[PDB]
Amino acid sequence: SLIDRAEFEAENRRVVAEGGEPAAGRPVLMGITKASLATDSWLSAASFQ
């Protein structure tokens, strides 16, 4: 799955407490269709395509 970087870092900042484990992340370079469709607001992604 593909998640945003800030949410990823904030989740690791939350989960280093309460017992420490990192989720392992690698950067991806995704195209602009998939970037627009995997947005947070369903309304824009519905209105696009």
Binding site: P27, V28, L29, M30, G31, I32, T33
Partner: protein
């Protein structure tokens, strides 16, 4: 458009993975290129490179035994951005 779509390009020219001299070979009707590592390790083998392409010229043409970079473009054409992300990170 294929740059912004992050497609794999038509004239795909694969890039290097580690420095060293090159293992150049002209196979049956197309090429066969392999990187000789310097630590070393496992040799990265690039088999299915068409002879319809061209080798990369710079400064002279790519000759055998020449010392390549970490992400030196081997053939001539268009590099896919996925591979240069995976090799040379976000900045490059």
């Amino acid at each position: 458009q294929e740059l912004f779509e992050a497609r794999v390009p038509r004239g795909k020219a694969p890039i290097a993975d580690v420095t060293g001299r090159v293992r150049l070979e002209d196979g049956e009707r197309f090429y066969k290129i392999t990187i000789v590592p310097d630590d070393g390790g496992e040799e990265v083998v690039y088999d299915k490179i068409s002879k319809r392409q061209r080798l990369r010229v710079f400064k002279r043409v790519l000759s055998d035994g020449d010392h390549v970079e970490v992400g030196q473009q081997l053939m001539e054409g268009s590099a896919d951005p996925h591979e240069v992300l995976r090799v040379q990170g976000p900045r490059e």
